[PDB]
Amino acid sequence: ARAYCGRFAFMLDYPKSYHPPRKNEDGDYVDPRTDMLPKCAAECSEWLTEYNACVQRIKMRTDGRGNCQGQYEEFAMCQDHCIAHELFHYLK
Amino acid sequence: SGFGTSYAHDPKWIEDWMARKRVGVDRMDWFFRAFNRLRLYELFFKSTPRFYAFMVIGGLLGSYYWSRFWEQYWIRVNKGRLYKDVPYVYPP
Amino acid sequence: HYFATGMFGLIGLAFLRGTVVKVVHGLWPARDAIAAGVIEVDLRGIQPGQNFVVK
Amino acid sequence: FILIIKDNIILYNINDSINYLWNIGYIIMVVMIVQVITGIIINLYMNINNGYKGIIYIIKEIYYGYILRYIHNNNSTLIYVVVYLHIIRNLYYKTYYYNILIWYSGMIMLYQLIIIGFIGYILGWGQLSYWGITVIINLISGIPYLILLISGNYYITIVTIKRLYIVHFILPIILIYVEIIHVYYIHYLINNNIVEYNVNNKIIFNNYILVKDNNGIIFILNIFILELNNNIFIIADNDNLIEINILVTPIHIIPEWYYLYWYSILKLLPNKYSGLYIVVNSISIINILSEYKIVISEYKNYKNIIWYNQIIQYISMIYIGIQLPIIEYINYGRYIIIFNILLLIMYLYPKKKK
Amino acid sequence: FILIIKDNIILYNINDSINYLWNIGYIIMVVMIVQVITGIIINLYMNINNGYKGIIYIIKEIYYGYILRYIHNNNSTLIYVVVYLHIIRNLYYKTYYYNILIWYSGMIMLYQLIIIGFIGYILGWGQLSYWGITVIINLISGIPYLILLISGNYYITIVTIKRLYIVHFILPIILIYVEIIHVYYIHYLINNNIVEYNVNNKIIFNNYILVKDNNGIIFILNIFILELNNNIFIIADNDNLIEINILVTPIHIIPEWYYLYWYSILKLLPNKYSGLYIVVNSISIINILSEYKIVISEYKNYKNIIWYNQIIQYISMIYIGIQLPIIEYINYGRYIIIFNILLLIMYLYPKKKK
Amino acid sequence: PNTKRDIRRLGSYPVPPESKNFWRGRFQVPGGQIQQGVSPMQQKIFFQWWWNLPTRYFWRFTKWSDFLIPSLMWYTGFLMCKNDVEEGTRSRYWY
Amino acid sequence: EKDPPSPPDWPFWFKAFSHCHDIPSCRRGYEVYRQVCATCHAARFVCFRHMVNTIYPENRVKQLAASFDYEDGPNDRGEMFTRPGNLLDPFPSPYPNEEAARFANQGASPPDLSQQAAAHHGGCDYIMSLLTGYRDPPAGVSLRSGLYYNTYFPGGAISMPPPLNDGAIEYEDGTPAVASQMAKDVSQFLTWAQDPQHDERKLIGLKMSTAALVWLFSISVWNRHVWTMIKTRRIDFTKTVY
Amino acid sequence: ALVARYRGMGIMADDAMNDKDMIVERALDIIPEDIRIQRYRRMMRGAVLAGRKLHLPLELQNYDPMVPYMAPYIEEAKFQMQEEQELLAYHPWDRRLYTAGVSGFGETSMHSTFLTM
Ligand code: HEC
Ligand code: HEM
Ligand code: HEM
Ligand code: HEM
Ligand code: HEM
Ligand SMILES: COC1=C(OC)C(=O)C(CC=C(C)C)=C(C)C1=O
């Protein structure tokens, strides 16, 4: 019925400062999220190894069956939880 | 000791606690003497019509200033994020 | 003691006033109804002899 | 009626040894009045034509309409919390052994409440309510032609809303009348105490019990005001803010939290009617839990181990209901239902002598 | 409540000398219940967003809907007929001299009925209804901003219909409660007889008075069934079946026949407020017609010449209301109002001694 | 009401209509009692809450500890079900 | 199988008890909605007058509404005409019916975004996550033309093209236009659109909650007082102490 | 646990019986005054302690709470009730309904049902 659940501000870790997005060699600002992708992937390495393993197991199957969506959704949920903790600090 | 059994009994520290009855001690009397010097009982409370007038008039003025205080609290917490705090610049 | 019982009455009566006053306020013409009701008409651009219609 | 009020409020004597669990009933009565008043006021700005837009028009155009909308939704959650907690109390202190008439009057109000709530969420014209009445009406699909009579068409439509709305308007007033029958038996058949016996420790109600009952209600108000304005707990499913499309099925067709114990029963049992029937058993067997006993005792103030396992069974079934219909949850949930029957049998069975 | 029923229906003693004019009240109670039931049932098929198209859908698509539509309209006419005849009776036998409490309770129901009927007309959503409320609401146009709070807009719209509808749904249930307060005083303050004194001629109610009261109600039913199915008397104006058009004014903006007395009063007096005020006088002065008397007598069973001229004044004013505002009718009607003030002064004034 | 011996009244003065329920809760006191008390206006009104605080919470937690074993069996079952659901989903799907 | 992946818990300003909707972000959000989302979605229940004196000044809202063309009528000849928009008009809708919209999105229907900020589990977090949740398909998953992978959409495959690209628009205030900013801003705006009375609700709630605490303390002192009479009595049988 | 709870309240097991049970009431009619006096005082102390969230001092807790002091009078009461049952209630009797303040369906107290108000 409502968009969010209310919380004390001490439970809401809002960015206390703002770091402007880095500028590219061309001069276009680079997305803070794209820069945070590798760092958050490393924090979720355990799930990424599970996904990478699946990819190689489905690669062997000589039939066309096999997907690795289940393990990708767990990795993605993990990488995204990491991003949420630090992304708004680079956004106005 | 005996917690969690049919032999449960009050520990010595709970029993020493209940041995301190504080009889004759009154450490908060200063507050009542001082409140009584405001003469609120002789002026408002004692008479029913005046007691009603204290609740009404005191609720009219209390409600307004309570709102006033928490409006200022809000204007301060959200400084720079309110519409009034950020006049809009029309595009050229 | 009578300050405490009175403060229960002071705050209660404020909540009652606010409740009653806000319920009756909802019967006032709504925000959409007020906006349509009063209409400001810009007379700039009309030419002498022209007739326009405003709903 | 002033003398009646004085006899039932001012000179009404109650034991001085009661806990704050004897204040739950006062709260139900107060929160019930609030739900009727807010309901009548909301109807002043909305009817049955299109609830989806009507709720939007209340929250955006009416002055302080948001208060009315959220109070009426959240105070329902509150009604069902206090009622369900009032039953848990009555089970713990076995207040049905000698005051069955009070228990019977209460159960009648429980039945009425379970119909009032279900139909209120279809008044919002939301997806999750559209497809949840379409799935509960099809449980009486066996009785020939009865679905058509109730629905008024071959599919749920505005016709179905125009009629359920009248039941939602009127049934609450009848509930208030049964509340009088309930308070009548309570005052004649004296209330039970925290102690199993009857003791000469009674004190008048207005000067003592009402002051304490108000401390309780104001405590709950502090918490209800926080939920009312900040949604600290998710008590309303978000999928009721999706416009009704009769072609697409919602992600999950679940009721509101206070029907998840009987939704799970219906999703766990393999035959549709068996489920319906086990939902009757839940609301009916609890009305005869002292009838077969033969000892001069009320089975009160023991460790209440059977009671604790029953209260947890309710909570655990509500959890299974939130979960999707995965097989592993279904198997475990069927065991929880088998366990409830055995616990219920333990309450019902009289004891042989060594 | 069974003992209460036995005390107030089965062992209730009433004088055996009463006429059939003492059965009017029974009929009001029965026809009132019928109006509530039919109203609630009609609500099951009605959409107050457009009540013009809604009434058509009831009479053409709902099975036996025509019965519900015409009963609810015609039984209103019937309610007002029986009520107005119940007052005429009470005036003739001066049943307000010693049973004023009964008279006061009745007048409260009369005030409520006057509001219920008017708002029900507007739910029809036809030309006459729309323009009629637009005219009445503009009598309180002096009180600043109150028209806007009642209407909900700068002109009557569905916004006004959605709120008046709630008053029309709920106010009848309160009327039924005041009917209990009315029957309470009647049973305590014994009913008046056709004779001025009190006599030991009372007989139980169920075995005698209820059989006679049913012969009366069945007589009225025969006549009401003929009107209900054949419209022997024109009791509903035809211009309420014209779609509302805010631009065109109806041929004549008049109320239902049972509001024509007060419509005429308002169309005769030259100042709008004077007219409103003379309507207040009509429904207030009649509550103090025995207060200033000083003789040990109830002024009962005389030739009642003043009474006859009052009853005719009512009928004649209803006629003037039907007639268009021809100047001649206005002059004659102003004399009828002056005459009514004089007749009412005659009732009020105590007498000096020769 | 109370037992018929308890509600039996010694006095012949009629029961007031507003005190019907009050006198249906009468008790026949055996042997007598000497009840005493002091007005709250001449007493400490919050001390007893503090004085009884430790014992109240001790005797509450000792009784509520009866449910510990039941609570642990139910939580063990909750964990077993959760893991069973996860392994079953990964087995049905998840290549 | 499992329900769609739960959206992360983003630290929006308005989530705290005493915090408001950040108007600067809501203004940027309107720009993102008008220039990106509006092509396919409609906000039927959002009107221009809702933004007056809340997000934008009255004159500015007039200019925005006047930029669009609406179909009004009939005229005196019974015909329908086209007029510039006004403060009383709803936000423009890209397609005339749901069937026209479906025909322009490979059968998929762009949902109305009026209440979408609260129509999905996660609420506002679901909008932010979805718009930033597009990824290369998982291994073994192959998507047809017009189908894109997104971790938060139920199923994984959404018919919406990735909508936010760096430099798509230029914010009037100069804020750097990056995909994550546009997401944070349009999520903020759609949250406001769902319940424009959010700030009044929370300011009046603050005054009610704090007052209720003072009320609790008064009824507590009262309760403690009257019950002292009862909880300190002494009943004796064979004993007497004064 | 039950013995401990009784000892904490300072009451006997037979004190715990609720007089809403008709056998208990009929027995309590005929208990001697000496038993009756001590029974009331124990029950009064128990309710005071329970209400004030206190427990009997351990100095007073060394007693056997399961002494069946009510047994003689329970048995006498059951005998009296069984005689009345067999000699006076062997048939579902017919009586004029809702008269004299009683439903006529068997109860003997006036105004003891809702329909008899
Ligand atoms: C501007 C930034 C936006 C925003 C905020 C959203 N969209 Fe789209 N969208 C499009 C289509 C075809 C669909 C339906 C696809 C289907 O589900 O198969 C959607 C869906 C959404 C949603 C709802 C997701 C849900 O689970 O239903 C939301 C919240 C949403 N969108 C937001 C198509 C488009 C476009 C067509 C090219 C464009 C441009 C956008 N969307 C842009 C936006
Ligand atoms: C609309 C919901 C109901 C309301 C308004 C309500 C109200 C109350 C009230 C005011 C009390 C007396 C105060 C108390 O001791 O707390 C009470 C007692 C009681 N209620 Fe309810 N009740 C409701 C639901 C129920 C239900 C569903 C049941 C049965 C499962 C029930 C059974 C009882 C019992 C047995 C008692 C007596 C408790 C004791 O012996 O003191 N009530 N109720
Ligand atoms: C036992 C009392 C009642 C309960 C438990 C109940 C329950 C609820 C519920 C759960 C809702 C859905 C709220 C939402 O959409 O999420 C609802 C809606 C509604 N109720 Fe009630 N209700 C009660 C009595 C009444 C009464 C007496 C009225 C007045 C006639 C009323 C009027 C309404 C209206 C108009 C709606 C639709 C608007 C809405 O969605 O908020 N209710 N009700
Ligand atoms: C004192 C009792 C009542 C009277 C005198 C009264 C009067 C009337 C009147 C005169 C009409 C207009 C009929 C027509 O359009 O010509 C009307 C309409 C209506 N009334 Fe009543 N009414 C009563 C009670 C009720 C009740 C309790 C309900 C149920 C909630 C109800 C529901 C309706 C509805 C839905 C309409 C609109 C449909 C219609 O036009 O027939 N009424 N009423
Ligand atoms: C909703 C409309 C009302 C109903 C249901 C109603 C009902 C009844 C009933 C059942 C009776 C007793 C039987 C009788 O003698 O006929 C009665 C008596 C009476 N009513 Fe009404 N009444 C209504 C309107 C009024 C009004 C408007 C007045 C006052 C102008 C009034 C004044 C009286 C009086 C004075 C009596 C006593 C007559 C005598 O002394 O016996 N009633 N009424
Ligand atoms: C959508 O609303 C509801 C359901 O949807 C599935 C329910 O299951 C139930 C439970 C239904 C039964 C037959 C036990 C109710 C009451 C409900 O409100």
Sort F30 into a burial class: Cβ within 10 Å, 0-12 / 13-18 / 19+: middle
User: Following CA atoms D197, D200, D205, D209 in sequence, which dihedral angle do they give, to the nearest 10 degrees?
Assistant: -60
Q: Name the residue of E90, E183, E310 whose CB sits within 8 Å of the most ligand 5 atoms, as the mutation to test its pocket.
A: E90
Q: How many CB atoms lie within 10 A of CB A77?
A: 19
Chains near D (3 or more Cβ pairs under 8 Å):
A, C, E, F, G, H
Q: Any CB–CB contact under 8 A between H52 and chain G?
A: yes
For residue D29 the two structure tokens come to 């009565």
Q: Any CB–CB contact under 8 A between F52 and chain H?
A: yes
Tokens 């759609």 correspond to what residue? Answer: G190
Cβ contacts of E316 within 8 Å, gap of 6 or more: E336
Q: Distance from first CA to last CA of chain H, Å, rounded? A: 43
Distance, CA of D185 to CA of D138 (rounded, Å):
38
Q: How many CB atoms lie within 10 A of CB H7?
A: 19
Distance, CA of A78 to CA of H59 (rounded, Å):
63
On whether the CB atoms of residues D13 and F25 are closer than 8 A, the answer is yes
Q: Which residue, among E2, E5, E6, E9, would best test binding to H if mutated, counting the most H CBs under 10 Å from its CB?
A: E2
Q: Across the interface, do D232 and A6 touch by the CB < 8 Å criterion?
A: yes
| Cis ω before G74 (30° cut-off from 0) | yes
Touch between chain B and chain D (3+ CB pairs, < 8 Å)?
Answer: no
Distance, CA of G123 to CA of D248 (rounded, Å):
21
Distance, CA of G141 to CA of G158 (rounded, Å):
13
Measure F59 CA to nearest chain G CA, in Å: 19
Give which of E202, E204, E158 is closest to E8, Cα–Cα: E204
Q: Any CB–CB contact under 8 A between E251 and chain D?
A: no
**E65-92 helix and E24-43 helix, angle to the nearest 10 degrees:** 150
Distance, CA of H66 to CA of D324 (rounded, Å):
53
**Long-range contact set of residues F58-61: C-beta below 8 Å, sequence gap at least 24:** F58/B3, F58/B10, F58/B11, F58/B14, F59/B8, F59/H53, F59/H55, F61/B3
Distance, CA of E212 to CA of E24 (rounded, Å):
11
Q: Any CB–CB contact under 8 A between G16 and chain C?
A: no
DSSP element (H, E) containing D293: none
On whether the CB atoms of residues E47 and E124 are closer than 8 A, the answer is no
Sort E4 into a burial class: Cβ within 10 Å, 0-12 / 13-18 / 19+: exposed
AA letter at D221? L
Q: Using a 6 Å CB cutoff, which residues line ligand 3?
A: D 35-36, 39-40, 42-43, 46, 55, 69, 72-73, 76, 79, 113, 116-117, 120-121, 123-124, 168-169, 172, 175, 236
On whether the CB atoms of residues G61 and G52 are closer than 8 A, the answer is yes
Please check if G80 is assigned to a binding site: no
Set of chain G residues whose Cβ sits within 8 Å of the Cβ of H48: 235
Grouping H, G, I as helix, E, B as strand and the rest as coil, residue F84 is helix
DSSP E strands, chain G:
69-72, 81-84, 148-149, 157-158, 234-236
Sort E181 into a burial class: Cβ within 10 Å, 0-12 / 13-18 / 19+: middle
Tokens 């720009």 correspond to what residue? Answer: G31
Measure B82 CA to nearest chain C CA, in Å: 22
Report the DSSP beta bridge partners of residue G150: G134
AA letter at E45? Y
Of F51, F61, F68, the CB nearest to B18: F51
Give which of D82, D84, D311, D83 is closest to D216, Cα–Cα: D82
Torsion sign over Cα E91, E94, E99, E100: positive
Please check if G37 is assigned to a binding site: yes
Give which of B75, G114, G151 is closest to D59, Cα–Cα: G114
B80 backbone φψ class: left, alpha, beta (φ>0; ψ -120 to 50):
left
Alpha-carbon separation of residue G239 from B21, F74, H38 (angstroms): 21, 52, 14
For residue C49 the two structure tokens come to 């002899």
Nearest ligand to residue E28 Cα: 5
- Please provide the size of chain F in residues: 95
For residue C13 the two structure tokens come to 């009566």
**Chain mean position to CA E10:** 30
Q: Across the interface, do H101 and E6 touch by the CB < 8 Å criterion?
A: no
**Long-range contact set of residues B72-77: C-beta below 8 Å, sequence gap at least 24:** B73/G18, B73/G206, B74/G18, B74/G20, B74/G203, B74/G206, B77/G18, B77/G19
Torsion sign over Cα E37, E38, E43, E45: positive
Measure H52 CA to nearest chain G CA, in Å: 7
Distance, CA of G65 to CA of G90 (rounded, Å):
9
Distance, CA of E222 to CA of E232 (rounded, Å):
12
On whether the CB atoms of residues E57 and E183 are closer than 8 A, the answer is no
Distance, CA of D242 to CA of B35 (rounded, Å):
58
Experimental method: cryo-EM
Set of chain G residues whose Cβ sits within 8 Å of the Cβ of C7: 214-215, 218
Chains near A (3 or more Cβ pairs under 8 Å):
D, F, G
Chain E nearest-CA residue for C34: E153
DSSP assignment, residue D64?
Answer: T
Chain H nearest-CA residue for D200: H44
AA letter at F1? P
Set of chain F residues whose Cβ sits within 8 Å of the Cβ of G233: 35-37
Q: How many CB atoms lie within 10 A of CB G81?
A: 11
**Chain mean position to CA E149:** 27
Q: Across the interface, do A4 and G138 touch by the CB < 8 Å criterion?
A: no
Q: Any CB–CB contact under 8 A between A11 and chain D?
A: no
Measure H43 CA to nearest chain B CA, in Å: 22
Grouping H, G, I as helix, E, B as strand and the rest as coil, residue C20 is helix
